[PDB]
Every structure is written in structure tokens, then in C-alpha cells.
């Protein structure tokens, strides 16, 4: 079986995977809504109790068996074999959601080469009538339909939403984004087609790239003190949101989305080496760095609005509240148009999203591909090169549901429901099985030898009580509080909300499905089927 080799080359694969575009959108867009600075205090308390146990669990269970994602449950609890297929099915939905976003950053990269970008003037190809973002000598007129050139650069240039009215009607097939889907899976194929050792000698420079972007990007914002006056009024103490829970339970879900365990990705990473006396160091560093990365990620975005809020003379609440994804594309686009430092930070910025775009696509794919190949020796022997390509042929087939439709209604729909009860139900069943059914007392017998110390006093309380505790609040509150979404002033039909609800519900139907086949085929009495199925007890 393959091996990683160098130490830091293994860690940086997890660093780049933990960082995600979702943390660039969900964290800042939700922070100010929950009181700004008052959102940071749950983010720290919920990360220690909520972020640590589920993160290291996939890293703990993977560093004990080294047999992929499906066959791993054949040893401890054979009844839970259906969790692997549940990860593969749910991974396909987010794949179509995640690859469509990369095409937008790639499409703007080709347009960023021009020195005179199409951001300072709405030319004769857009809805130029509503272009009213020009801070002249008191000549601004806010109206109901007033928009920005960056908004039209995002609302109709690439989306072309004016054609499609809703989910009841589809638009055209824009070949602009279709060419972008080729470049995405192109770079990902050459990395995985060669082997796993190629990751050790390719992506060890990509992890250092995006962290330098936030560094230089903050220095440019600090040139004028006018931007500093905005962040001061941004981080004021808004403690009224602590009592009223609202979406306080969602604040813990953002940490679960930031780290994102249970996808069989960290499992396949730790599936190639024991990592004796250095695995616990990888988890502790990844937690604190993600806590700082998301903080520095949002800290630089709102620093841009501080300068725009000066000339606008308006609260940051009214600006960029209609959607989450619309914040980044409209916020940064207005900065380079006003700042005289264009032609330099344009190309440097869009490569950040593309660099993180390739990281999670390659780092996340290794978990799904490593699973099925382990149980198929006739495929892993000779047909490894052909089978991995067959998975890529199915990937973009689902992505065309959003591109060919000509509308971002699949985007806003798959934001909450794809990562909603789908991932949550699968992640809960993993922790409940390893802890309650499988003897945790016997689990720490061998893991302490690899760690060099008894993991008690920190792991005995978390996985037992804290792990099934925080996970229960999201699933119950999500049903009792349907998050009615909106996209560019368009209320979804009630019947369409059931579509996103049944897909997320039916995504993990395989778990209760294959359990029945394994038990019905097993002869004997009812008690024997449980003992024969669950081997520890």
C-alpha cells in the first residue's frame, strides 16, 4: 500500500483541506448577523467541545485499521457497513455544488488580465441603467432597483438570471462555464492519475500560497486610516443576541462545516501510516490554525467595507445582506475599482479561491477513491487508472444540473440542505457506534501505545457525552425552524422546499437499507442476528 513520506507534506494536505471557500462565506456573512463580536465567543467555546472530538474521531478511527472507509466497519461493527456508501452519495451532491463555484473564480481570472477592468464603467453590454455606484460630489440616488457594477458583474454577467424566472423553468447552456469545468477536473486528474506520492511533491507549495494573500491584502487596507474607522464600529459589543438563541445552534454547525469530519477524507489520509507520537500534534495545530484562519479570513473582508462605508455613510448591515455568496464577489470587486492599485491584486486575488478550490477537490477526492479501491482488488491491481477516470466522468454529469439550467437556484438550495441533516445524520451514527456499542475502554488500550500516554481525562468525557449532545441540537432545531431561503428577491415555492428536504433525507437511506439485507439473509433467532451482526456484543 502507498505511503506519504515527509511529515509536513502530510499535515499541509489537512491544512489546505480544512480551509474552504465555505469558511470565506458562511463565517463572515453569519458573524455580523449574530452580533458580530458576540459570534466569536460561541465560536471558541463550541470549537473546543464541539470541534475537537468529531475532528480527531475520523483521524483516530482511520489510524487504527488502515483498510479504507467501507471495510473499516467490517471489524468493529459490521452492522454499520452502510456509512461508506452514505459518504459517497452525499459527496456527489456537494461536488456539483463545489465545482460550479470554481468556474466563477476561473472565469474572472481570464478577465483580470486586462489593465482597464470592466468595473469602473458599465459598458454597452450590461444593465447599465441601474449602475449607480459612483461616489461623486453628492450625486447618489438610492432606489429600490439601484445596483452596483459589481452586482451586475455577478447578477447578470455570469449568472444571466434574468432569463430563468425560477425552478419551474430552465435557461440556456452557457459554454463559458462549460469550458471552466474542463480545467477544474483537468488539474485534479493529473495529480491523482499518477499516484499518491505525487501529492508529496506538488501541493506542498500550494498550502503556503493563500496565507500570504491575507497578509498582503490586509496591509493594503491599512494604508488609509479611513478603513480603520469602519472595523471599530463593526466589532462593537452586541450582547443582546446571546440570550435569544436564534441560530446560535447554527454557530456550532459552522465549526462542523469548517473542519468537516466524517467524510472519510482524514481516514484515507491516516490509512497509509501509523503516525506514532505525532498524530495528536497534527490535530491540535489544525484546530487552532482554523480558529485563526476563519477569524483572519473575515477580518480582512470587512476591512474593505470600512473604506466603502466612509463615502457611503451607511451601516454595514444594509450592505451585502441579500445572499452569502454575493458578498465576496461584490465586496472585493468594488475595492480594486476605487483603489489605484489595479492590475496587480486582481490576478493575485482570484488565484486564492482557485488554489483552495484545487486543494479540497483533490484532498477530498482521496477519501472516496481510497474506499472502493481497497475492497476491489481486481480493480486496484490493473484497472486502477481506468476506474478512477470513470468516477470523474460521473462528476461533471451532475454539475450540468446547475450550469445547463442557467440559474443559481441549485446553489442556494444546496447550501443548507446538502450539508444539513444529510452529513449530520451520517456523522452522528459514526460517533454513537464507536463509543456505545464498540467498547471505548478497549479502544484506548492500543491507541495509548501509539500516543505514548493514556488518552483519559480528555477523551473519556467528550466522545461519550459531548459528542452526541451538540449533534442533537442541530437536527431537532432544523426541523422545528425551516430556514426559508431567498435569492435575489425571490421566495421559493413551498413544494420546492420539499425537494431539498427529501434529497437530503433520501441521501442516507442506504444506511437503514443494507442493514435489512444483512440481517434477513442471516438465519437463526432474533438475538443471534444481533450477535452475528455486531461481533463485539
Amino acid at each position, epitope marked *: 500500500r502507498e505511503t506519504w513520506g515527509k511529515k509536513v507534506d502530510f499535515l499541509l494536505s489537512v491544512i489546505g483541506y480544512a480551509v474552504d471557500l465555505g469558511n470565506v462565506w458562511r463565517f463572515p456573512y453569519i458573524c455580523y448577523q449574530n452580533g458580530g463580536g458576540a459570534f466569536l465567543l460561541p465560536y471558541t467555546i463550541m470549537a473546543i467541545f464541539g470541534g475537537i472530538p468529531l475532528f480527531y474521531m475520523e483521524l483516530a478511527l482511520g489510524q487504527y485499521h488502515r483498510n479504507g472507509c467501507i471495510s473499516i466497519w467490517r471489524k468493529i461493527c459490521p452492522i454499520f457497513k452502510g456509512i461508506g456508501y452514505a459518504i459517497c452519495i452525499i459527496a456527489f451532491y456537494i461536488a456539483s455544488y463545489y465545482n460550479t463555484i470554481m468556474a466563477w473564480a476561473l472565469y474572472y481570472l481570464i478577465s483580470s488580465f486586462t489593465d482597464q477592468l470592466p468595473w*469602473t*464603467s458599465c*459598458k*454597452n453590454s*450590461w444593465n*447599465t*441603467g441601474n449602475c*449607480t455606484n459612483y461616489f461623486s460630489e453628492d450625486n447618489i440616488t438610492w432606489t429600490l432597483h439601484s445596483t452596483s457594477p459589481a452586482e451586475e458583474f455577478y447578477t*447578470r454577467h455570469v449568472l444571466q438570471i*434574468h432569463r430563468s424566472k425560477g425552478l419551474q423553468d430552465l435557461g440556456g447552456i452557457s459554454w463559458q462555464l462549460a469550458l471552466c469545468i474542463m480545467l477544474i477536473f483537468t488539474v485534479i486528474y493529473f495529480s491523482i492519475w499518477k499516484g499518491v506520492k505525487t501529492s508529496g511533491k506538488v501541493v506542498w507549495v500550494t498550502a503556503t500560497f493563500p496565507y500570504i494573500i491575507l497578509s498582503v491584502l490586509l496591509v493594503r487596507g491599512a494604508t488609509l486610516p479611513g478603513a480603520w474607522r469602519g472595523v471599530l464600529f463593526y466589532l462593537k459589543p452586541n450582547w443582546q443576541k446571546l440570550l435569544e438563541t436564534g441560530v446560535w445552534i447554527d454557530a456550532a454547525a459552522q465549526i462542523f462545516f469548517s473542519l468537516g469530519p466524517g467524510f472519510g477524507v482524514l481516514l484515507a489520509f491516516a490509512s497509509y501510516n501509523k503516525f506514532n507520537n505525532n498524530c495528536y500534534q497534527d490535530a491540535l495545530v489544525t484546530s487552532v490554525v482554523n480558529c485563526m484562519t476563519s477569524f483572519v479570513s473575515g477580518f480582512v473582508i470587512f476591512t474593505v467595507l470600512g473604506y466603502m462605508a466612509e463615502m457611503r455613510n451607511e451601516d454595514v448591515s444594509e450592505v451585502a445582506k441579500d445572499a452569502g455568496p454575493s458578498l465576496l464577489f461584490i465586496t472585493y470587486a468594488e475595492a480594486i475599482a476605487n483603489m489605484p492599485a489595479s492590475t496587480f491584486f486582481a490576478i493575485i486575488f482570484f488565484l486564492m479561491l482557485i488554489t483552495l478550490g484545487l486543494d479540497s477537490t483533490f484532498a477530498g477526492l482521496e477519501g472516496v477513491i481510497t474506499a472502493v479501491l481497497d475492497e476491489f482488488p481486481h480493480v486496484w491491481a490493473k484497472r486502477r487508472e481506468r476506474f478512477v477516470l470513470a468516477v470523474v466522468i460521473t462528476c461533471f454529469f451532475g454539475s450540468l444540473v446547475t450550469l445547463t439550467f442557467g440559474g443559481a437556484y441549485v446553489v442556494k438550495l444546496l447550501e443548507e440542505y446538502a450539508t444539513g441533516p444529510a452529513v449530520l445524520t451520517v456523522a452522528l451514527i459514526e460517533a454513537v457506534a464507536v463509543s456505545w456499542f464498540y467498547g471505548i475502554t478497549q479502544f484506548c488500550r492500543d491507541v495509548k501505545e501509539m500516543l505514548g500516554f493514556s488518552p483519559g481525562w480528555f477523551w473519556r468525557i467528550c466522545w461519550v457525552a459531548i459528542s452526541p449532545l451538540f449533534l442533537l441540537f442541530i437536527i431537532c432545531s432544523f426541523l422545528m425552524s425551516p430556514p426559508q431561503l431567498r435569492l435575489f428577491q425571490y421566495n421559493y415555492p413551498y413544494w420546492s422546499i420539499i425537494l431539498g428536504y427529501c434529497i437530503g433525507t433520501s441521501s442516507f437511506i442506504c444506511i437503514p437499507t443494507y442493514i435489512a439485507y444483512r440481517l434477513i439473509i442471516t438465519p437463526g433467532t432474533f438475538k443471534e442476528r444481533i450477535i452475528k451482526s455486531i461481533t463485539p456484543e
Partner: antibody, heavy 118, light 110 residues
């Protein structure tokens, strides 16, 4: 509504220079794209160029760039055009055009009375 | 440059009958679901007066006689029974940059 008033005519000489004017008013001149058009007896229309008071971006074609030079000043609320090195073929009438916005296809709604380049 | 042609060159539109004028072209100008093509109304001495927005939507200040529709590189300016005051030569506009061109023209008469 329509206040696109040009200046008077001018005599054409071989190697002359003309300073055509147009009063931009009656609408938001600081957001639309002005244009110019040629017309002669027994011939059709033809596009000349484009300009924006505030930015100054101009794009030419149709062999007009050899002497075309558009200028605009947002403070004056006008738009000018300089055409040096004229000839007999340049004798025509020019209308002060104004295209609409993309909500309806960038159609030319308002027009001027026109000045005869005799 | 976008080529623009029109035919027939002279239409003898009698009183009480429709009209049909097309705008052929090489492109392929359909972008953003709004075909960049329009029609003007040029009389002797008067300036151009707009007729239709995007060759599909009737405009303000114009009678309800004018209309247009089609798909691809071939449209048609379907008009209601003509009135004697609507006599004017019509050109086909092109607003797709960078270069813009106008059609040849057709004389509409009785």
C-alpha cells in the same frame, strides 16, 4: 425632456477644423453613453464613436478614427467633437445621439435638431 | 464588422395591408437573451424616431402597429395595416460592440 441643442453650421475648407457642440440635459447625462451619426442626401446612416462624460472612453471604426476626436466635460454638461482635415465628402449633417440602457436593448431614444456641415 | 442587408428594396404597402421587413446578418448576435437589433423611423428632414425596443417590445410614443419577433439570423418586422403618415425609411440597428453597423434600407411606400 429633449434638450440636445447643437451649435450652428460651419464652412468646410480643405484642412479645416470644426468644433461641434451639444447640450447634455433633460436626463442623467453622467450615466449614459453619447454617440454621433452621419447622414447625407441619398445615403443612409453610419455610426461614428462613443464617449462618456466623466471617463472619456472612446471606440472608433468605419475609417473615422483617422481624424475623430471626442471630448466631454461632466461639469459643463456638454459633449464636443473635433474633426480636423475635412474634405468635400465630409459635408453632411450630424445628430447628437444618445443610446438607452441595457434594460431595453440600448436603443437611441433622444436626438438633436442637427447641424449642417456645409 | 457585422454585415447587414435588407430586402425587398422598395415595398408598395397599400392601405389596409400588413408589411414584412427583415434584417439578415452573418452573426450570431444573440447574447444575454436580448438580440441587439432595433428599428428607427427616418422621414425627410426629421431625425430618427425609435419604433421597437430590442425588436420585440413596443415602445412609448409610437403607435401599436409595429411589432417584431423571430429567432436566429432572420427576423421580420410585422406591422399592422399601415397609415399614410407612417411613410418612412427604416434601418436595422446593431449595438454589439466594438464596431457598429446599420442596414442598407428599404423604402416603404404605397
Amino acid at each position: 425632456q429633449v434638450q440636445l441643442q447643437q451649435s450652428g453650421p460651419e464652412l468646410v475648407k480643405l484642412g479645416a477644423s470644426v468644433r461641434i457642440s451639444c447640450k447634455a440635459s433633460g436626463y442623467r447625462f453622467s450615466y449614459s453613453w453619447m454617440n454621433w451619426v452621419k447622414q447625407r442626401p441619398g445615403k443612409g446612416l453610419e455610426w461614428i464613436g462613443r464617449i462618456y462624460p466623466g471617463d472619456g472612453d472612446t471606440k472608433y471604426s468605419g475609417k473615422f478614427k483617422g481624424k475623430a476626436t471626442l471630448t466631454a466635460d461632466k461639469s459643463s454638461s456638454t459633449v464636443y467633437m473635433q474633426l480636423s482635415s475635412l474634405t468635400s465628402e465630409d459635408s453632411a449633417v450630424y445628430f447628437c445621439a444618445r443610446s438607452a440602457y441595457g434594460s431595453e436593448g440600448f436603443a437611441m431614444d433622444y436626438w438633436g435638431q442637427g447641424t449642417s456641415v456645409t | 464588422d457585422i454585415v447587414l442587408t435588407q430586402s425587398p428594396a422598395s415595398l408598395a404597402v397599400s392601405l389596409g395591408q400588413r408589411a414584412t421587413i427583415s434584417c439578415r446578418a452573418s452573426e450570431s448576435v444573440d447574447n444575454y437573451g436580448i438580440s441587439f437589433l432595433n428599428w428607427f423611423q427616418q422621414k425627410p428632414g426629421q431625425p430618427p424616431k425609435l419604433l421597437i425596443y430590442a425588436a420585440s417590445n413596443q415602445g412609448s410614443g409610437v403607435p401599436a402597429r409595429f411589432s417584431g419577433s423571430g429567432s436566429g439570423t432572420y427576423f421580420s418586422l410585422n406591422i399592422h395595416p399601415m397609415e399614410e403618415d407612417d411613410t418612412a425609411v427604416y434601418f436595422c440597428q446593431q449595438t454589439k460592440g466594438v464596431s457598429w453597423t446599420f442596414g442598407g434600407g428599404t423604402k416603404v411606400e404605397i
